[PDB]
Design a protein around this ligand. Structure first.
Ligand SMILES: OC[C@H]1O[C@@H](O[C@H]2[C@H](O)[C@@H](O)[C@H](O)O[C@@H]2CO)[C@H](O)[C@@H](O)[C@@H]1O
Ligand SMILES: [Ca+2]
Length: 769
């Protein structure tokens, strides 16, 4: 491995061998159907709202999120990098596809498949990933750095449907070596969004752009149609010329054939025919090929950049709504702009690299933090781009001031911006992309007073209920199978209009966003104030016994729905206390003196009653009226956790909070599988897991990272990192269950999971407040 010294892979990068098998991978622990795409994953490529492409550690372009809100796992085998090498003075060379595997069907059989094991590594520190190629039969060693320009406080490049592949090649041998690197890409127009004739009209063309300081050669893969539809647009691949390399290309080869039309050229001398065949296809799959060839003298290094772009301007949801994607603001909406995007990337990727280094460096250079934590902190951010992200730039067939945004809860539970989940999972947005965060919360503000009197069938019991109640915050802002932003509350399994935590979390989220963006944005507080007051006032009406706190009703009425709460609960109670104190402070800032006085009286009354009803001398009871009331909940003081973040001070006595957290650490962590798997949600005071409901027996990844941050703020440094460590281990480590780049909501004692690719674990960013 002489190539690793010649590139800058950080030590915290997640690593695995190319072609490595993994023996202990977990699977779903529920009886209903649930996604399991295996452990062959990688860091995604593509910006926010662009649609993402998951290239795996084996090198395949396999996890497709280009259809916004859908997860499609299938390797498009034609999409590859391939290498040709010949030692100078030798008659023949070798050619090899850089993919640890082979096609299932008989297509592309003439290509050299099955990149051997123990011959290279994959590395990932999102948004960067790397492949190294160190193979006995390849004299020249190769590495590629691949990324998309995901940059905090940048809402432009961060949106781009683009990837850069910066190759580095080094000759450690005593002889000159001829080397070719080739990028193949299938014309994927019609891969989604066409019932019939999936390839028909597809055509490829070569573009050459020589502009003194920059020669670029690119294949543009489009369609003859000018239909402005979900499926139509362009993919492009290309390369920038550098000193000492020459470029060759093949505009059209058949992907639904044996491949020899391309391979017989490339495997001969690593040089292609430069044939520019623009004729459309009818039934055959087609693709393009871009290759560079060069000669490396002994000890010589060369760097050559490739790029990939996809101009697919329109997203369509299942309800029929068609929206333009965010990036269209910068490149246009007509779907004929893939080359412009690619050219931007090939001429600016070095700037983008430095911008990425600039925002990672403060964390990476802090040597007081262990590398494992950085691996998790950065790689968890995969979900921002990969979570079915929707970022609109106008509805198809119409100007507008704001660009609505949606991140999914997950693909199995296909709901945009699920509020109770985003309470934990929105930390990276507020901290790194605050304008997006604020926009999402204004979307929620705008839903508060919406009334939908028509009824729906509640799935868990069968009872009918009102869709959307005035003054109650929605569970979500819709589904990709229906109408995001328009038809809210797509979730019907329970009735969110009776939930006791959503209104509180909403208020806490509003004030969080003000506090963590510098306490300067009064306009944001003004925009949201009516909704805040309404939300707390409607929740006050659910106080039955007149203790000043909303009553949980012993039925599904909060986040932990099936692990029911009754009476005053630690969870909803603490959130209520914190929300009231947050409302007080907004009151003071906006000079709404009556609101201030009101919420202050409500706060003091509820605070006293909370302490009296729930403090047992060691921790806070789960609730007042359940069968499982003395259970130790991991999330018992969620309100106080947010109050620390919001700099709202002590809603509960310091001494009591400290004891509760020590108890949670002693029990929920260290008495659950030796504290190597996170915090189990519920534990009985006898040191046995609360078995009243499945949820209680689950570790929730995002709850645990949140709990770690809470411990950290309260000076429990060792406990915080030990708690978080178990979540890292399960996700990323060889001893875990192989959930890298698909971190689930939950696992049980056995390490099997529920709901892979989940928003909540983004809560790890709360540890950086
Ligand atoms: O995991 C907590 C999370 O649950 C989500 O509801 C799931 C539920 O967990 C599952 O048991 C059921 O079969 O499916 C529903 C989705 O329809 C819920 O969306 C979240 O609010 C909650 O945080
Ligand atoms: Ca009450």
């Amino acid at each position: 491995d002489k190539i690793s010294h010649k590139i800058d892979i950080p030590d915290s990068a997640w690593t695995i061998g190319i072609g490595e098998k993994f023996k202990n991978a977990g699977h779903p622990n529920v009886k209903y159907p649930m996604i399991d795409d295996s452990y062959v994953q990688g860091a995604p490529l593509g910006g926010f709202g662009a649609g993402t492409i998951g290239r795996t550690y084996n090198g395949g372009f396999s996890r497709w999120h280009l259809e916004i809100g859908k997860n499609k796992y299938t390797t498009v085998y034609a999409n590859q990098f391939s290498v040709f090498q010949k030692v100078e003075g030798n008659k023949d060379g070798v050619a090899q596809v850089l993919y640890a595997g082979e096609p299932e069907n008989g297509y592309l059989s003439s290509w050299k498949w099955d990149y051997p094991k123990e011959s290279g590594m994959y590395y990932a520190l999102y948004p960067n990933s790397w492949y190294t190629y160190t193979n006995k039969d390849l004299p020249v060693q190769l590495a590629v750095k691949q990324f998309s320009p995901i940059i905090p406080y940048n809402y432009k490049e961060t949106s781009y449907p683009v990837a850069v592949f910066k190759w580095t090649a080094y000759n450690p041998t005593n002889k000159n070596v001829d080397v070719s690197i080739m990028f193949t890409w299938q014309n994927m127009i019609g891969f989604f969004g066409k019932q019939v004739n999936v390839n028909s009209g597809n055509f490829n063309k070569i573009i050459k752009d020589k502009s003194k300081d920059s020669e670029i050669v690119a294949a543009v893969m489009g369609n003859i149609s000018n239909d402005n539809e979900e499926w139509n647009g362009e993919y492009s691949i290309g390369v920038k010329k550098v000193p000492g390399v020459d470029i060759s290309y093949k505009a059209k080869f058949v992907t639904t054939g044996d491949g020899s039309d391309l391979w017989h050229e490339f495997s001969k001398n690593g040089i292609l025919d430069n044939k520019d065949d623009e004729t459309p296809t009818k039934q055959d799959g087609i693709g393009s090929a871009i290759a560079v060839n060069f000669k490396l003298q002994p000890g010589q290094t060369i760097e050559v950049p490739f790029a990939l772009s996809w101009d697919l301007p329109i997203m369509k949801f299942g309800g029929g709504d068609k929206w333009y994607k965010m990036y269209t603001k910068y490149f246009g909406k007509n779907g004929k702009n893939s080359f412009a995007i690619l050219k931007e990337a090939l001429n600016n990727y070095q700037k983008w690299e430095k911008m990425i280094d600039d925002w990672q460096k403060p964390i990476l250079s802090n040597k007081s933090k262990p590398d494992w934590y950085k691996t998790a902190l950065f790689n968890e951010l995969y979900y921002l781009a990969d979570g079915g992200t929707a970022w609109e730039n106008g509805k198809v067939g119409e100007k507008r001031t704001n660009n609505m945004f949606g991140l999914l809860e997950c693909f199995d539970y296909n709901y945009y911006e699920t509020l109770d989940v985003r309470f934990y999972g929105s930390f990276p947005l507020v901290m790194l992309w605050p304008d997006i965060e604020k926009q999402v919360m204004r979307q929620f503000a705008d839903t508060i007073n919406v009334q939908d009197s028509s009824e729906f069938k509640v799935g868990s019991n069968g009872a009918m209920a009102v869709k959307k109640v005035q003054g109650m915050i929605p569970h979500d802002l819709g589904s990709s199978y229906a109408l995001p932003w328009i038809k809210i509350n797509a979730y019907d399994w329970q009735n969110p209009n009776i939930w006791k935590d959503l209104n509180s979390k909403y208020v806490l989220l509003v004030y969080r966003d003000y506090v963590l963006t510098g306490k300067t944005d009064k306009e944001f507080l003004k925009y949201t104030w009516k909704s805040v007051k309404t939300a707390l006032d409607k929740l006050k009406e659910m106080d039955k016994d007149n203790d000043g706190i909303p009553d949980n009703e012993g039925i599904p009425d909060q986040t932990y729905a099936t692990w029911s709460m009754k009476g005053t609960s630690a969870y909803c109670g603490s959130l209520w206390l914190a929300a009231l104190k947050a409302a007080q402070e907004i009151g003071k800032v906006l000079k709404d003196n009556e609101a201030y006085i009101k919420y202050n009286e409500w706060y003091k009354i509820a605070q006293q009653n909370f302490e009296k009803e729930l403090w047992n001398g060691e921790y806070y009871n789960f609730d007042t009226e359940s069968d499982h009331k003395d259970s130790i909940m991991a999330d018992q003081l969620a309100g106080q956790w947010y109050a620390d973040i919001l700099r709202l001070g002590d809603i509960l006595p310091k001494d009591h909070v400290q004891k509760a957290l020590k108890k949670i650490y002693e029990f929920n962590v260290m008495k659950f599988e030796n504290g190597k798997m996170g915090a189990v949600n519920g534990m009985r005071p006898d040191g046995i897991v609360d078995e009243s409901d499945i949820q209680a027996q689950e570790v929730w990844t995002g709850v645990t990272y949140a709990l770690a941050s809470f411990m950290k703020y309260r000076g429990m440094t060792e406990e915080a990192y030990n708690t978080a460590y178990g979540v890292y281990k399960m996700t990323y480590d060889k001893s875990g269950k192989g959930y890298w780049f698909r971190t689930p909501e939950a696992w049980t004692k056995d390490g099997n999971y529920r709901a892979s690719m989940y928003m909540r674990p983004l809560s790890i960013w709360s540890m950086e407040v």
